[PDB]
């Protein structure tokens, strides 16, 4: 028996990256999983490297980031790589969640990797945010204020929790140092959860774009998907290179190159491109608690897809009506993204509310209804 199978440690690696039996027909949207793995590796490498140069003290943090840009050899690269990969991480993770929603990867028997995934998505948001704050530019400080005040929504104890998370009466040095600690930590927690959702997936194996069983026709993970994943690694690095080397600040907010001034917040508050959809959700709802609940619920509601999709068929390849509904849902999520960065003015206030209702009605109304009707259309239509 082959060493790779005999030896307990190798056997675990083997089962994940070499002999792992995968469906033979996964398309390029199955490549985001490995890109997110690559982003996670880049982020750890550049992140730990920035941590060797960055100073968490509020009096020095912004300056240490300038020192990284200016004085550290290749510091510019490491910094921009870290910042840009955080954007690519979100492109890839929305792509990956997109793929999963379109192909019904959330349905049995994969509800567990899906649900662990939803937590990875929340942790990524908190990691990337905590990392945003470490620059301690204007947006950084204000972002900190808002995120740490989302717990004020929680009644009674809320206000005290806020002060406890700031370690002060305002965002200041204490907050910045604890964000550094946690921003360093959170990615390792995220890598644990990323691993766990794979372990949960390993019981069912990957879904495939047809949504049928692949038990009839499996391919070893290597060499087929190893070499397939290189294509996207290099395509990703091409896009990475164009941002990192040619336009490192395209995805950034100018205001973060202003040091944090707790006395003013910029007139143009617009968070990271990837938080924009939920930020528009938060703006839409005119209640404090309401706004917060809705924003969190916009992520947590993904947890109910396993229930509300009533289809007897896995995924959307074969469901014209569901594909159209999914197209409108995705475009609405992009519209929310767009509305996140306009000014809070007519007519976009009402529009943002309509998009927020449409976002939630996909999970609560439309998906359950459409999936029910298409079940019936398949049965009647094929008699």
């Amino acid at each position: 028996m082959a060493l790779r199978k005999k030896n307990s440690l190798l056997n675990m690696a083997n089962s994940y990256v070499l002999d792992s039996p995968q469906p033979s027909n996964l398309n390029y949207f199955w490549n985001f999983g490995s890109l997110l793995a690559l982003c996670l590796v880049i982020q750890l490498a550049t992140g730990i490297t920035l941590a060797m140069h960055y100073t968490s003290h509020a009096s020095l943090a912004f300056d240490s980031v300038e020192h990284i840009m200016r004085d550290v050899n290749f510091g510019w690269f490491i910094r921009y790589a870290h910042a840009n990969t955080a954007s690519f991480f979100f492109i890839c993770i929305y792509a990956h969640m997109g793929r999963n929603i379109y192909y019904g990867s959330y349905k049995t028997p994969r509800v567990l990797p899906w649900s662990i995934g939803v937590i990875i998505f929340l942790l990524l948001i908190i990691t990337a945010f905590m990392g945003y704050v470490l620059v301690f530019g204007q947006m950084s400080l204000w972002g900190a204020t808002v995120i740490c005040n989302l717990v004020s929504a929680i009644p009674w104890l809320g206000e005290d929790i806020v002060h406890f998370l700031w370690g002060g009466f305002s965002v200041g040095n204490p907050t910045l140092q604890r964000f550094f600690a946690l921003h360093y930590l959170m990615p390792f927690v995220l890598a644990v959860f990323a691993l766990l959702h794979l372990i949960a997936l390993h019981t069912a194996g990957s879904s495939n774009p047809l949504g049928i069983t692949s038990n009839v026709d499996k391919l070893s993970m290597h060499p087929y998907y190893s070499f397939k994943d290189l294509i996207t690694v290099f395509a990703f690095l091409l896009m990475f290179t164009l941002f990192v080397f040619f336009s490192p600040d395209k995805l950034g907010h100018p205001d973060n190159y202003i040091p944090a001034n707790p006395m003013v917040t910029p007139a143009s508050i617009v968070p990271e491109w990837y938080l924009l959809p939920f930020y528009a959700i938060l703006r839409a709802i005119p209640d404090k608690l309401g706004g917060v609940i809705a924003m969190v619920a916009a992520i947590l509601i993904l947890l109910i897809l396993p229930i509300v999709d009533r289809s007897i068929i896995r995924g959307n390849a074969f469901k014209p009506i569901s594909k159209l509904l999914f197209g409108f849902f995705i475009c609405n999520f992009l519209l929310l993204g767009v509305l996140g960065q306009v000014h809070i003015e007519p007519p976009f206030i009402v529009l943002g509310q309509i998009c927020t209702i449409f976002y939630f009605s996909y999970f609560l109304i439309l998906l359950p209804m459409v999936s029910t009707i298409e079940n019936i259309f398949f049965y009647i239509g094929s008699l």
Partner: protein, 85 residues
């Protein structure tokens, strides 16, 4: 629900003969021109409406909203803005 090599959990297969040739024996890019043009056109045409319909609708919606917003903050749009607030 999925096993492993040898006991993958396929319903028993019988009567399928599968044939392939060596990667070294095959032209990896055989019929690439045909595929790149005709096959991609086929696949694009078949999926086009699923992209075009929501993109065109939400681009219309955005366009209308952004044009109204622009207009409300002109001198001509003073009155309509005063009503909106």
């Amino acid at each position: 629900y999925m096993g492993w090599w040898g006991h993958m959990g396929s319903p028993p297969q019988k009567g399928i003969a599968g044939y392939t040739i060596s990667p070294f024996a095959a032209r990896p890019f055989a019929g690439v021109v045909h595929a790149a043009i005709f096959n991609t056109f086929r696949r694009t045409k078949n999926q086009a409406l699923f992209v075009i319909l929501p993109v065109s609708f939400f681009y219309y919606v955005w366009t209308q909203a952004s044009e109204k917003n622009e207009w409300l903050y002109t001198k001509a749009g003073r009155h309509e803005l005063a009503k909106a607030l």
